[PDB]
Amino acid sequence: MERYESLFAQLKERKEGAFVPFVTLGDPGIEQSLKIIDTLIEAGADALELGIPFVTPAQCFEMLALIREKHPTIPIGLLMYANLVFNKGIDEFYARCEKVGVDSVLVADVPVEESAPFRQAALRHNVAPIFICPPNADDDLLRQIASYGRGYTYLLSRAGAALPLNHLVAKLKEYNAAPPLQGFGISAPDQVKAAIDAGAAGAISGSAIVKIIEQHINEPEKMLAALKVFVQPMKAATRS
Amino acid sequence: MERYESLFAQLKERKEGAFVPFVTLGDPGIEQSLKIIDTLIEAGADALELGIPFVTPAQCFEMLALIREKHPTIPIGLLMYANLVFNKGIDEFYARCEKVGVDSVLVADVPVEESAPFRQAALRHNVAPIFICPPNADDDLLRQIASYGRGYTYLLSRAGAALPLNHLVAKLKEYNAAPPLQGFGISAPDQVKAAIDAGAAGAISGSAIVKIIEQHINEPEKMLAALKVFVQPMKAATRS
Amino acid sequence: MERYESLFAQLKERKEGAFVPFVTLGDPGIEQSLKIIDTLIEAGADALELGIPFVTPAQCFEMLALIREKHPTIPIGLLMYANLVFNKGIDEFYARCEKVGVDSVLVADVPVEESAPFRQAALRHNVAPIFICPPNADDDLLRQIASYGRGYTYLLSRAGAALPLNHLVAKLKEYNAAPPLQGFGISAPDQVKAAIDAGAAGAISGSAIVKIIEQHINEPEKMLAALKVFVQPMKAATRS
Amino acid sequence: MERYESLFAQLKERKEGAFVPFVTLGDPGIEQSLKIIDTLIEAGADALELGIPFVTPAQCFEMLALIREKHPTIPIGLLMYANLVFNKGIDEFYARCEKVGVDSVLVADVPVEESAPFRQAALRHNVAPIFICPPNADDDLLRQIASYGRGYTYLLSRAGAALPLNHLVAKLKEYNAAPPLQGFGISAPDQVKAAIDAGAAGAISGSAIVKIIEQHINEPEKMLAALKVFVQPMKAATRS
């Protein structure tokens, strides 16, 4: 929706896909985390995929509000399980997401057929209902997902029968599904480079982002450089 | 709408307003005209304000289609009188605008209270209904315009009682009116620089664009350089 | 020298060349003339190229003294024929130039090989000896000019065999000649824009300045606006 | 010389610098190595910087011969220590380089003042004597290098007192030294982009090329893609 849309528009004209790193809010720390997200951004990031722990929620939402204010157009999408949402009452969650800036919210554990209350809640509070399309999704599921989801589409790699990731992108182009962002096991310019050739609109990585934070969880300033060094290439793997 | 929106979004983040040159399709020629628009674009132009003569319409629309294909996200807005529209049947006009790429259409002669059929037609065919806000618009008119218009807002300068151009921008910010682009008598980085300081979202110039085309209506290649030299400064007048 | 030097220094850092209009002292009148120069300055002028008639000399020097006092750092260079100088005794001329503020003096009619007494006089009274480098200057002449001249270099356009104006700028960069200011037939942002791309350090125009004074030699107040409108663009043609 | 010259000529006209990756012949294997060089080439490489191990020499020269035959105009320059050369008798080495295609040969360990026999040998067998210009080279050294070297110039970065890399490029332009290719610690479009802005004629990288070969020293086909993905950006960092 809006942000995601436009971002994808200016990605077309540039003949390039998007690189969407994944990070866990408040990891390793709140001040550091923020200090991370900005760096990811100014390194090539076109859209963030922010993970939510369980650092309380009010803080994670407080950071999202900060990020937003700091970065107005960057597509902010969250990734979490149903508990937190089930905790704050479905509606109030999304309403609280619509108030801090988030553009979309993917609730793992919620299976497609039981998404109803979320798909509505996000739509009620202008948030994009995001779904996961497994590598082995049947024509039926494809059709479901395509219509139900707004913003972007989370395409599951054949690493998480899996039809080649090209058939899928097409089967989406066909049923007007939101632009697909392939995720899972993509921590190399190689895989990102391929992801896009296959027709996906962008890649997502998170493991690598974690490992680097790990090896430098003592060097706050060094940790960022490694991350600053990490993006550019990955992000560059999505061009010309 | 969409294009205009997003453009304005990435203009905020950049802390800069938009420069919107005005040109008349097929002026001085069709091949040249296009050769003009591209040059204006690659010089700093953030959004085009394309004038329509009466070169037949089918050609002007044919050029708009070309431009669009050549420049996918650039906000394309037209500027013309009610005849051409009244000629092709209100609806079919906008429908034909929605098919070639245009994002908005400002129909001069149509007074605000008699816009109804256009405001609808544009909305039916996803085009932004644009209106003119004179420097001396009463609180009433402001409210009218604000609600009726989508995309951008054409703010008339005190050169075309005129309240200082700051009150207006505010009175729009207040009534959630589309971002105001000030036009008329602004052919200098000076006036563009000021336009933006006053809070306008961007400036429009057309006379200068004409004069240059005039002095070089014999040097197709030279004509472009003068224009290439014309933008940058003007466009630069909208930053930081 | 000094003024010219520093001016050129702060022109580099800005990544922009200089715009040097030319005007004839006391044209159309003494009070008006001054009223002209200030306006040229406050419009973008980086350095003046003041022409000398034959309004007696004592007045022209009186104006230069006024200008200087009014504008301390502006590089003031004069342009005249050898008579006036031959009139007041070479030395006393330059000494009188060093006393009113002028920074340089280009004596047309004086050929390069017969400049000796002037090159000395200007050096004796801290004035920059300026020379003209024709578009068809042989390697020899280039070397002469380069060494003999201080301050700036007057590069003659291929409009006044002429080697492309790029070879020249280089051949000067090579023989450490003063920064070259191209003059003759440049009355358009176009030509100024190109002059600088070619590597020249600045452009000079005078015809246009005259024409405008001509069309408004009845509107003292209007005449200035036209001139105020004339600079900015021309001057803007020398940036980024 | 010749190849290097012409390459630099068609680089000017294109307004772009050269990207010169570095690889070690027979790394990780002979068949693979070649399979590497071709890929580097068809990815954007304008000139190769081939490293020599100590895979025997006869093989490395056999590969150079193959490469050359496969790629006739690509500037082939080698990078090695004095032993191999001292091994095959200075002259016979260069003579053997002139026979396989190499255009230049940089012999590290050989200090500038003891280069004599090499500078001659390369000149006798039409090979370009290459030298290293440290970031802190005094005016003297600059002059030495400039005259003694043909083809290109290896400009050492302030990462391997170091004067800003702009002074150097100029000081070479001044003493007509072969076009400078900056090397050491440049494994990012960033640094390549900057290298060129500073006026260098091209950049060199080798670490990155190694790391990639490392992470994929098991995926011969995958290894190439990563490398294919590596160039383009880096090479693109040298344009417009």
Side-chain angles (χ1 to χ4, degrees):
Chain A
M1 196 168 90
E2 205 290 308
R3 293 195 167 88
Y4 276 115
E5 170 202 63
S6 318
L7 161 67
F8 286 148
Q10 281 139 180
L11 283 184
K12 187 68 57 50
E13 180 183 311
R14 285 173 178 174
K15 288 252 296 186
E16 58 189 59
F19 166 62
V20 174
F22 165 102
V23 101
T24 325
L25 289 181
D27 189 302
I30 294 172
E31 223 212 315
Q32 183 56 26
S33 185
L34 294 178
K35 219 64 187 183
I36 291 173
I37 290 64
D38 293 330
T39 286
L40 280 168
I41 294 170
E42 276 65 68
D46 310 318
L48 310 167
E49 196 73 6
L50 302 160
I52 280 170
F54 219 51
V55 181
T56 53
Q59 293 165 294
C60 296
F61 274 107
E62 189 172 356
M63 285 165 78
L64 299 166
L66 289 176
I67 309 178
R68 175 53 73 203
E69 175 51 46
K70 242 180 288 66
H71 309 266
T73 87
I74 171 64
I76 290 204
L78 305 173
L79 172 268
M80 26 99 69
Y81 296 118
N83 289 74
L84 190 286
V85 184
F86 278 130
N87 164 61
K88 299 170 63 182
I90 291 66
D91 180 280
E92 170 179 276
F93 181 65
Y94 288 91
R96 225 307 167 65
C97 284
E98 171 192 45
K99 299 172 190 177
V100 288
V102 176
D103 318 291
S104 61
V105 201
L106 172 165
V107 184
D109 28 28
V110 175
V112 183
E113 299 69 52
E114 316 315 294
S115 62
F118 307 74
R119 186 157 46 71
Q120 300 183 183
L123 290 180
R124 304 207 288 266
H125 309 298
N126 296 302
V127 174
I130 292 300
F131 302 100
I132 318 175
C133 175
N136 61 303
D138 65 353
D139 186 42
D140 283 303
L141 182 61
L142 293 177
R143 291 169 177 288
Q144 305 175 60
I145 301 169
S147 71
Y148 302 130
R150 311 290 184 301
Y152 81 82
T153 312
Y154 195 108
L155 196 57
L156 191 54
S157 61
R158 59 73 67 197
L163 338 172
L165 307 158
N166 299 210
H167 161 65
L168 296 302
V169 171
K171 269 314 190 74
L172 301 190
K173 297 178 178 181
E174 188 170 59
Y175 313 150
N176 304 62
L181 292 173
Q182 177 195 47
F184 197 86
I186 293 165
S187 65
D190 281 62
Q191 301 156 303
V192 179
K193 207 297 174 301
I196 273 59
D197 293 314
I204 308 182
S205 188
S207 166
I209 301 286
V210 181
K211 286 294 181 64
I212 282 180
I213 293 176
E214 209 183 65
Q215 303 185 63
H216 298 285
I217 196 173
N218 291 301
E219 301 107 57
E221 180 180 63
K222 292 185 180 178
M223 175 189 286
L224 294 183
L227 293 175
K228 288 156 178 165
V229 168
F230 172 68
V231 173
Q232 312 188 310
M234 283 299 263
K235 174 52 182 148
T238 77
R239 293 173 181 163
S240 43
Chain B
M1 196 168 91
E2 205 289 307
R3 292 195 169 87
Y4 275 116
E5 171 200 62
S6 315
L7 160 69
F8 287 147
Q10 282 138 180
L11 283 185
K12 187 67 58 51
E13 182 183 309
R14 286 174 177 173
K15 289 251 296 187
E16 58 189 59
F19 165 63
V20 174
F22 165 101
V23 101
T24 324
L25 289 181
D27 191 299
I30 294 172
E31 223 211 315
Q32 185 56 27
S33 184
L34 295 177
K35 219 63 188 183
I36 291 173
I37 290 62
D38 292 328
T39 287
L40 281 168
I41 294 170
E42 277 63 67
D46 310 318
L48 309 167
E49 197 72 7
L50 300 162
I52 280 169
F54 219 51
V55 180
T56 52
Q59 292 166 297
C60 295
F61 274 107
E62 189 174 355
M63 285 168 77
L64 300 166
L66 289 178
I67 309 177
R68 174 52 74 203
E69 175 50 46
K70 240 180 289 68
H71 308 266
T73 84
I74 170 66
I76 290 205
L78 306 173
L79 172 269
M80 26 99 74
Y81 295 118
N83 289 75
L84 189 288
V85 184
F86 277 130
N87 163 60
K88 299 171 61 181
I90 291 66
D91 180 278
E92 171 178 276
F93 181 66
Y94 288 90
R96 224 308 166 65
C97 285
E98 173 192 43
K99 298 172 190 178
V100 289
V102 176
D103 317 292
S104 65
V105 200
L106 171 165
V107 184
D109 27 30
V110 176
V112 185
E113 299 68 53
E114 316 314 296
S115 62
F118 308 73
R119 187 157 46 71
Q120 299 183 184
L123 291 181
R124 305 207 287 263
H125 309 299
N126 296 303
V127 173
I130 293 301
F131 302 99
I132 318 175
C133 177
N136 61 304
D138 65 350
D139 184 41
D140 282 302
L141 182 62
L142 293 177
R143 292 168 175 287
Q144 305 175 60
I145 301 170
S147 72
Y148 303 130
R150 309 291 181 302
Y152 82 84
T153 310
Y154 195 110
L155 194 58
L156 191 54
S157 60
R158 58 72 68 198
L163 340 173
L165 309 157
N166 299 211
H167 161 66
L168 295 302
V169 171
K171 270 314 192 73
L172 301 191
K173 297 179 179 179
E174 188 170 56
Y175 312 148
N176 303 61
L181 294 171
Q182 177 195 50
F184 197 85
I186 293 166
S187 67
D190 280 64
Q191 301 154 303
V192 181
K193 208 298 171 301
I196 274 56
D197 290 316
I204 309 181
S205 188
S207 166
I209 301 287
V210 181
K211 287 292 182 66
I212 282 181
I213 294 178
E214 210 182 66
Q215 304 184 64
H216 298 285
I217 197 173
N218 291 300
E219 302 107 58
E221 180 180 64
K222 292 185 179 177
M223 175 190 285
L224 294 185
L227 293 172
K228 287 157 178 164
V229 169
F230 173 70
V231 176
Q232 309 187 314
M234 285 298 267
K235 175 50 187 149
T238 78
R239 290 172 181 164
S240 89
Chain C
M1 196 168 90
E2 205 290 308
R3 293 195 167 88
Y4 276 115
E5 170 202 63
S6 318
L7 161 67
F8 286 148
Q10 281 139 180
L11 283 184
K12 187 68 57 50
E13 180 183 311
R14 285 173 178 174
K15 288 252 296 186
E16 58 189 59
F19 166 62
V20 174
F22 165 102
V23 101
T24 325
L25 289 181
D27 189 302
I30 294 172
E31 223 212 315
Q32 183 56 26
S33 185
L34 294 178
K35 219 64 187 183
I36 291 173
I37 290 64
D38 293 330
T39 286
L40 280 168
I41 294 170
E42 276 65 68
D46 310 318
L48 310 167
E49 196 73 6
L50 302 160
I52 280 170
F54 219 51
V55 181
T56 53
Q59 293 165 294
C60 296
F61 274 107
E62 189 172 356
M63 285 165 78
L64 299 166
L66 289 176
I67 309 178
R68 175 53 73 203
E69 175 51 46
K70 242 180 288 66
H71 309 266
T73 87
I74 171 64
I76 290 204
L78 305 173
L79 172 268
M80 26 99 69
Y81 296 118
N83 289 74
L84 190 286
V85 184
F86 278 130
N87 164 61
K88 299 170 63 182
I90 291 66
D91 180 280
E92 170 179 276
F93 181 65
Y94 288 91
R96 225 307 167 65
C97 284
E98 171 192 45
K99 299 172 190 177
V100 288
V102 176
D103 318 291
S104 61
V105 201
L106 172 165
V107 184
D109 28 28
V110 175
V112 183
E113 299 69 52
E114 316 315 294
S115 62
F118 307 74
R119 186 157 46 71
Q120 300 183 183
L123 290 180
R124 304 207 288 266
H125 309 298
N126 296 302
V127 174
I130 292 300
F131 302 100
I132 318 175
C133 175
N136 61 303
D138 65 353
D139 186 42
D140 283 303
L141 182 61
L142 293 177
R143 291 169 177 288
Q144 305 175 60
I145 301 169
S147 71
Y148 302 130
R150 311 290 184 301
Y152 81 82
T153 312
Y154 195 108
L155 196 57
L156 191 54
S157 61
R158 59 73 67 197
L163 338 172
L165 307 158
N166 299 210
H167 161 65
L168 296 302
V169 171
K171 269 314 190 74
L172 301 190
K173 297 178 178 181
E174 188 170 59
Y175 313 150
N176 304 62
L181 292 173
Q182 177 195 47
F184 197 86
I186 293 165
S187 65
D190 281 62
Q191 301 156 303
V192 179
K193 207 297 174 301
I196 273 59
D197 293 314
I204 308 182
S205 188
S207 166
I209 301 286
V210 181
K211 286 294 181 64
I212 282 180
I213 293 176
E214 209 183 65
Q215 303 185 63
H216 298 285
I217 196 173
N218 291 301
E219 301 107 57
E221 180 180 63
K222 292 185 180 178
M223 175 189 286
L224 294 183
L227 293 175
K228 288 156 178 165
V229 168
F230 172 68
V231 173
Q232 312 188 310
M234 283 299 263
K235 174 52 182 148
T238 77
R239 293 173 181 163
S240 43
Chain D
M1 196 168 91
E2 205 289 307
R3 292 195 169 87
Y4 275 116
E5 171 200 62
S6 315
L7 160 69
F8 287 147
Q10 282 138 180
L11 283 185
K12 187 67 58 51
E13 182 183 309
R14 286 174 177 173
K15 289 251 296 187
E16 58 189 59
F19 165 63
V20 174
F22 165 101
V23 101
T24 324
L25 289 181
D27 191 299
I30 294 172
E31 223 211 315
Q32 185 56 27
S33 184
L34 295 177
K35 219 63 188 183
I36 291 173
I37 290 62
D38 292 328
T39 287
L40 281 168
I41 294 170
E42 277 63 67
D46 310 318
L48 309 167
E49 197 72 7
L50 300 162
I52 280 169
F54 219 51
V55 180
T56 52
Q59 292 166 297
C60 295
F61 274 107
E62 189 174 355
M63 285 168 77
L64 300 166
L66 289 178
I67 309 177
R68 174 52 74 203
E69 175 50 46
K70 240 180 289 68
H71 308 266
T73 84
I74 170 66
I76 290 205
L78 306 173
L79 172 269
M80 26 99 74
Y81 295 118
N83 289 75
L84 189 288
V85 184
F86 277 130
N87 163 60
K88 299 171 61 181
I90 291 66
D91 180 278
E92 171 178 276
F93 181 66
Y94 288 90
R96 224 308 166 65
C97 285
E98 173 192 43
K99 298 172 190 178
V100 289
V102 176
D103 317 292
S104 65
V105 200
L106 171 165
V107 184
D109 27 30
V110 176
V112 185
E113 299 68 53
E114 316 314 296
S115 62
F118 308 73
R119 187 157 46 71
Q120 299 183 184
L123 291 181
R124 305 207 287 263
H125 309 299
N126 296 303
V127 173
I130 293 301
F131 302 99
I132 318 175
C133 177
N136 61 304
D138 65 350
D139 184 41
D140 282 302
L141 182 62
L142 293 177
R143 292 168 175 287
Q144 305 175 60
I145 301 170
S147 72
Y148 303 130
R150 309 291 181 302
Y152 82 84
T153 310
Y154 195 110
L155 194 58
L156 191 54
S157 60
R158 58 72 68 198
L163 340 173
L165 309 157
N166 299 211
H167 161 66
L168 295 302
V169 171
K171 270 314 192 73
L172 301 191
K173 297 179 179 179
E174 188 170 56
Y175 312 148
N176 303 61
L181 294 171
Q182 177 195 50
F184 197 85
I186 293 166
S187 67
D190 280 64
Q191 301 154 303
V192 181
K193 208 298 171 301
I196 274 56
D197 290 316
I204 309 181
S205 188
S207 166
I209 301 287
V210 181
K211 287 292 182 66
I212 282 181
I213 294 178
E214 210 182 66
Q215 304 184 64
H216 298 285
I217 197 173
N218 291 300
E219 302 107 58
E221 180 180 64
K222 292 185 179 177
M223 175 190 285
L224 294 185
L227 293 172
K228 287 157 178 164
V229 169
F230 173 70
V231 176
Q232 309 187 314
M234 285 298 267
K235 175 50 187 149
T238 78
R239 290 172 181 164
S240 89

